Structure 1
């Protein structure tokens, strides 16, 4: 997260860290047994880490659970990142508590202008590399689809939306992938892609979760 702020230990209890010997992507707990992340974060051998703040220090509120199965969206296109969403099931249910909680799915999509909270352990430098060990947060509004499509001509589909600032300075970045974009208490987005980080006229692009609610519900009930 570039231009963001330290969230504060466990203030975003639904945030998860996907670990394969190291943290490689973020994710969101939707219930005691299921996590939603980005399809491009797909990998074999994933351990889901919950109740995390500093990812390099065992602080006492963590829950480390292995993934039993991963399901990438049937229409995921790795070339364009359209349908960038994947569901991960935990080998055993997590114990929900004040520091480990699930995030609600949207009943409807949000509109441009709505403020959202994006979080992660990704790079904090636009022109450089510096990875924080504690969770970073960023408040940013959903931008109009016209602003989004003007920035990325011919690359934005109906399954995507832009969020951030056209002036640059604040944006998600490498390492934030798969992380949550929560607006009005609902999971509205998943950190997907962008062009660099915090660059003028190059906002972040996110998977539009509201379009996948039915798929999510059907898939988790049958697995």
Structure 2
């Protein structure tokens, strides 16, 4: 997260870290046994780390649970990045309380201008590299489909949306993928891609979760 702020220990209870010997992606807990992340975050031997703040130190509220299933959307296109969503089943149910909690799926899509909370342990620099110990947060608005397409000609599908600030300086970055974009208590997006990070005229692109609600519910229930 570039241009953000320190969330505070466990202030984003649904945020999880995907670990494969180190942190490589984020995710959002939607129930005691399931996590939503990005399809490009599909990796081998994933371990989900819940209740995390400082990703480099054991603080006492962590729950490390291995992934028992990692289901990439059947229509994920690795070239266009369309349908960039993945569902991870936890090998054992996570203990939910305040520090570890699920986030609700949307009942309807969000409109342009809606303020959302984006979080993660990704790069905090637009130029260069610096990864935080603690979870970072960022308030950013959902942008119009028209502005998103103008920023990325011939690249934005109906399953993607832009969010951020066109002047640059605030954005999600490498290490944030799979993480949440929560608006009014609903998980509306998944950190996906963008041209660099926090660059002028290049807002972050996110997977439009509201288009997958039925698929998410049915897939989870059938696994």
TM-score range, shorter chain: over 0.9
Secondary structure of the residue aligned to 2:149 is helix
1:58 alignment partner in structure 2:
58
Unaligned runs of 5+ residues in structure 2 are none
**Cα distance in 1 between the residues matched to 2:177 and 2:222:** 26
**Cα distance in 2 between the residues matched to 1:136 and 1:61:** 18
TM-score, normalised to structure 1, is: 1.00
Residue 26 (str. 1) matches residue 26 (str. 2): yes
1:61-101 per-residue CA deviation (whole Å, 9 max, x = no partner) reads 00000000110001000011100000000010000011000
2:99 alignment partner in structure 1:
99
1:169 alignment partner in structure 2:
169
Secondary structure of the residue aligned to 2:35 is strand
TM-score, normalised to structure 2, is: 1.00
- Displacement of 1:114: 0.3
Structure 1 vs Structure 2 CA RMSD: 0.4
Secondary structure of the residue aligned to 2:132 is coil
**Cα distance in 2 between the residues matched to 1:67 and 1:171:** 28
Return structure 1 stretches of 4+ with deviation > 6 angstroms.
none
- Displacement of 1:33: 0.3
Unaligned runs of 5+ residues in structure 1 are none
Secondary structure of the residue aligned to 1:220 is helix
1:127 alignment partner in structure 2:
127
- Displacement of 1:44: 1.2
**Cα distance in 1 between the residues matched to 2:21 and 2:70:** 18
1:115-153 per-residue CA deviation (whole Å, 9 max, x = no partner) reads 000000000000100000100000000011111000000
1:201 alignment partner in structure 2:
201
- Displacement of 1:49: 0.3
**Cα distance in 2 between the residues matched to 1:52 and 1:158:** 33
1:217 alignment partner in structure 2:
217
**Cα distance in 1 between the residues matched to 2:176 and 2:133:** 12
1:109 alignment partner in structure 2:
109
**Cα distance in 2 between the residues matched to 1:220 and 1:41:** 18
1:129-182 per-residue CA deviation (whole Å, 9 max, x = no partner) reads 000010000000001111100000000010000000000010000000000000
**Cα distance in 1 between the residues matched to 2:97 and 2:137:** 21
Q: Would you say how many aligned residue pairs link Structure 1 and Structure 2?
A: 223
**Cα distance in 2 between the residues matched to 1:64 and 1:169:** 33
1:10-49 per-residue CA deviation (whole Å, 9 max, x = no partner) reads 0000000000110000000000000000000001100000
Q: Spell out the pairing of 1:144-163 with structure 2 (5 A cutoff).
A: 144-163=144-163
Residue 71 (str. 1) matches residue 71 (str. 2): yes
**Cα distance in 2 between the residues matched to 1:2 and 1:47:** 25
